[PDB]
Ligand binder design. Structure first.
Ligand SMILES: Nc1ncnc2c1ncn2[C@@H]1O[C@H](COP(=O)(O)OP(=O)(O)O)[C@@H](O)[C@H]1O
Ligand SMILES: Nc1ncnc2c1ncn2[C@@H]1O[C@H](COP(=O)(O)OP(=O)(O)O)[C@@H](O)[C@H]1O
Ligand SMILES: [Mg+2]
Lengths: 594, 594
């Protein structure tokens, strides 16, 4: 039943020590063990620890070429199988040394709970993945939902480290474990419900986050091989107390077909058209809800246009509040264009002689007249508050650059019912997971939609309060929150990281290297997960929470294998987690066989 | 009675040396020891120290595979139990080595006092926590009240390290140990009183810092377990000479129900309604006491609005000094609004044709008029003061963005008596502890309240003087005093750190990592305390006061275990402190269970 004995040839310190592996037992690199030592007065002191180094030496072989004789039986040789243990816990916390010869044994039952501080987690423990020998690793939800700890940060080489798919596994674990229930017993209103929970996620890389609403045909065939190979009792999900089933209550939203002058509205998706709902903003919303700054996120040097943008934002806001009509466009009455080079065919003209702006192009043209033509090119003084003409043209030119890409999204030609039906609500009643398909959008349109949608949820939580947890799963954090660049979308993320704990917005974010992301986003994550990391980044300052033992291991980490670090447990523990039950590509949705 | 003997196999130097543990004795890692050696001429020299390394070896084992046989007795081997002693003090200051074979014994009586420099502390020593075996740790109050020492800085993993709970323990020890008396009698005029010691603390994270008035139902069940396990003589509080009771005279202040257009005033309290008093500021107080800059504390790039803020601050200051009325609002006579988009409703129009500003939004609207509409936009040059319109709308817009969150706190509609009663006074007569509930406020409203309150106490001490000690207990020191940002709330924290010693304001600050806080705040902390530190941060330059021997140990410190480092004693000492006698959550007050 024991696994080894504490070695005496090496120093035995309370923090770290070596032990010799017993015959007939194997010790893997990441095994969790427990050793119990006796004090002089006879009181026990238990040491819970994790293996970080493992080796084998040949005892007494002398010259190396003796092996041929040695293994033939001619020369006597003993094999020395040794393991180093990094102590994570001392239950009576006497920092005394164990005695050499104390029995080392695998932490398997309550001993494992003590080894992973599961007593500190209490009911808030939920499946975080599988350990070496099929024992689920317990994550403390109180360090994920804001109660005691913030959000999560996942890192690793894209394509190899499985961060996005792991984040979806964490979502499945959180929704399917009842951990939101158990930890909603904490109080009646501080945080409450497992039904209340919601998740918002964006489909940046094209068509990969759709088919969460269809089961993965391939899961059992790939997962059978793992259960066959590692000799597990069952499929991993059942080991977790998790079901091997896809996401439920899923809302799929996509931009409207990039329709050029077409009133017909259909989503852009080629590979999936069923169950996909188009989402659009309206010109009047755009001005009423102050969406203008979220067009501006350059992730480069640029200038300080904050004055210009702030002024026109307020001008549009008061304009939209002045609108009395039910339409989705913005009616402006002060647009006269003798020779502002726009054509007169298509402008819908109001009953009161006003011009009704129906497309994003018109909204930008009207911004051009007020800023650069209102009075023979010097512009409307009330719109350009003495701002430089160059500064104006930059602003205008960046709006022009993205309007070809953003125009289908922001529509003033729609009628009021179409606008209320197509309006993007990541918090719609009865929906648990909302996927926003921004894959066909441009690098600018993408962060526009991400910007206002995150802001809309956050504004909603400020206004309403914090008894519903909303999960935002965001890949490529560096572009959204760059280390030195300053931007409005970054600002909303700064708001979710720093204030979202007590507001109820949890970020499960991922990036290839945390060193390219804003320090304040990475710093505010209680849970840090590491996939296969780059050999150069492992020694960076952002990954010191990995002991040196772990970087070399972290360079060859296999897909499906992650190192999670959570505040309760002072060491990274390695975990594997099942394949997605949810389809992650089109052919995994095969209703009828292959 | 002895514990070991100085070893002769390792070097014996006066600063560091090893000794062999006697059989039947246990030597923990942080134990305090004394060894006495004899000079050639017969004079004794005492060495007091602290263990920093401890190990066990197998002496006389050739191969590690022999280990199993060794335990049976088949082969011969002896266990070597050795400890390294980091010398902290020599009674006679002679830097001569102790001879191998000198006797090592636990510092237990007067010897313990000599190891912890308690003779330097004199009457100013007070309990700072419990040592390895039940003896209280002396803390030098003179290094906390400003006489020879200053303030306190606590570092550690939030949620695991118990820094907030420890800080309240320090208040409890300071108030209930009569140390304020003992060290007040050196000269009564110089520094006077245990009744004159007060505390101000802020309740940000949850409803966690209310119910400090109420006893903790759960602490006997939790503290019984520790006394049972560690074989201590009594409950830890009795060991310290401290009582297990809550704070004596407490005042709980809360924001006013976020009342929308409601004259009724009630605290925002949802779980604790009894004993909570609402606090409010008045528009007139806002202008008279110069509360304007403290709205602006973004702690980022921001802008140079200091000129704008300084101008409008002085303008509102002279405006308030000109006010003759008894009302709480500000009456301005130069506000005309022919098309300012303002409303025709009750402005409590004055008898003299002036407008009486009663809400924060009105004050911002009047500011918008003077700065952006006065002379059809260019404004009153006694207000805009040649400042650009972009900067002007920026100052305006940031006031607008924050107005919704700060409006319920700043009321000019209140009557003079409601104002004098609801005014927040951390120094109220007959109060020892003041708790400010800002958990319901936004990130901006919180920074505001903390700013003007800390400034109010600081101004009062400048004006009055220093025979009352006021303790400010502040968690999350990284957001309030960032390392690189610059804000007014950081400036009052800087004034407290650099001047608070001789003014009587002592800061008990806590943050996850000292490396994220302003250097000047952390540098002026005479007492540094460390709970479980991040593996990454222990090697940072801000934690060099931890010797390398401690780092690995500090990575795994258990909740309730802290390393205090004080100027008198040259090394960090590990301590344990009781569970809170005061309730720290709702169900702790009245659980009636077990
Ligand atoms: N548990 C797993 N084991 C192995 N491969 C997995 C596992 N889960 C997902 N994958 C696959 O490995 C890749 C996962 O990477 P993904 O998370 O999509 O990208 P990244 O993590 O770089 O954002 C995809 O090929 C995915 O289908
Ligand atoms: N004396 C104590 N010993 C052990 N745990 C304690 C003690 N006092 C409080 N705790 C618990 O430890 C945690 C302390 O976290 P807290 O102090 O609130 O946050 P932080 O330490 O980051 O400021 C909470 O679970 C608290 O109930
Ligand atoms: Mg991805």
């Amino acid at each position: 039943d024991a696994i080894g004995m504490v070695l005496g040839t090496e120093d035995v310190t309370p923090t770290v020590f070596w032990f010799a592996v017993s015959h007939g037992a194997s010790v893997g690199l990441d095994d969790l063990v427990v050793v119990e030592t006796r004090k002089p007065d006879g009181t026990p002191v238990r040491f819970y620890g994790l293996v970080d180094n493992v080796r084998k030496r040949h005892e007494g072989v002398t010259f190396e070429s003796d092996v041929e004789d040695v293994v033939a039986g001619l020369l006597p040789a003993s094999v020395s199988y040794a393991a180093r243990v990094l102590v994570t816990r001392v239950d009576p916390e006497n920092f005394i040394p164990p005695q050499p010869g104390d029995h080392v044994r695998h932490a398997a039952g309550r001993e494992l709970a003590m080894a992973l501080s599961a007593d500190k987690m209490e009911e808030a423990a939920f499946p975080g993945g599988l350990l070496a020998d099929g024992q689920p690793l317990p994550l403390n939800f109180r360090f994920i939902n804001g109660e005691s700890g913030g959000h999560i940060n996942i890192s690793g080489i894209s394509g190899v480290a499985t961060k996005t798919s792991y984040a979806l596994f964490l979502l499945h674990s959180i929704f399917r474990s009842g951990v939101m229930d158990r930890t909603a017993q904490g109080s009646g209103g501080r945080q409450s419900g497992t039904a209340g929970g919601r998740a918002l996620i964006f489909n940046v890389k094209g068509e990969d986050l759709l088919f969460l609403d269809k089961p993965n045909a391939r899961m059992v065939e790939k997962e059978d091989k793992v259960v066959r190979a590692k000799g597990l009792s069952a499929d991993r999900y059942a080991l977790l107390g998790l079901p091997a089933e896809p996401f439920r209550d899923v809302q799929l939203l996509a931009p409207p077909r990039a329709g050029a002058a077409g009133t017909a509205i259909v989503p852009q998706t080629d590979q999936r058209s069923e169950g996909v709902t188009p989402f659009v903003f309206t010109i009047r919303e755009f001005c009423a809800r102050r969406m203008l700054p979220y067009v501006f996120s350059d992730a480069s040097a640029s200038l300080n246009l904050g004055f210009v943008i702030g002024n026109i934002e307020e001008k549009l806001f008061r304009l939209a509040a002045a609108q009395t009509g039910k339409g989705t466009g913005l009616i402006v009455h002060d647009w006269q264009f003798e020779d502002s080079e726009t054509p007169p065919e298509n402008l819908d003209f109001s009953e009161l002689g006003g011009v009704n702006l129906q497309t994003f192009e018109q909204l930008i043209s009207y911004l051009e007249y007020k800023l650069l033509e209102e009075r023979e090119g010097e512009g409307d003084p009330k719109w350009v508050l003495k701002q430089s003409p160059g500064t104006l043209r930059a602003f205008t030119r960046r709006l022009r650059g993205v309007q070809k890409y953003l125009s289908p999204l922001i529509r003033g030609d729609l009628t009021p019912e179409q606008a209320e039906g197509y309006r993007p609500d990541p918090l719609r009643r009865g929906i648990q997971l909302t996927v926003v398909d921004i894959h066909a959008l441009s690098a600018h349109a993408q962060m526009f939609v991400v910007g206002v949608l995150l802001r809309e949820v956050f504004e909603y939580k400020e206004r309403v309060g914090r008894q519903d947890t909303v999960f935002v799963v965001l890949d490529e954090l560096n572009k959204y929150a760059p280390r030195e660049g300053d931007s409005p979308i970054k600002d909303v993320l700064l708001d979710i990281a720093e204030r979202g704990r007590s507001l109820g917005i949890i970020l499960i974010g991922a990036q290839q290297t945390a060193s390219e992301v804003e320090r304040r986003i990475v710093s505010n994550a209680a849970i840090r997960v590491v996939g296969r990391l780059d050999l150069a980044e492992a020694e960076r300052p952002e990954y010191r929470f990995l002991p040196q033992s772990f970087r070399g291991r972290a360079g060859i980490l296999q897909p499906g294998t992650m190192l999670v670090s959570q505040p309760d447990v002072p060491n990274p523990v390695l975990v594997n987690y099942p394949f997605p039950a949810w389809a992650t590509r089109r052919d995994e949705v095969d209703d009828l066989g292959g």
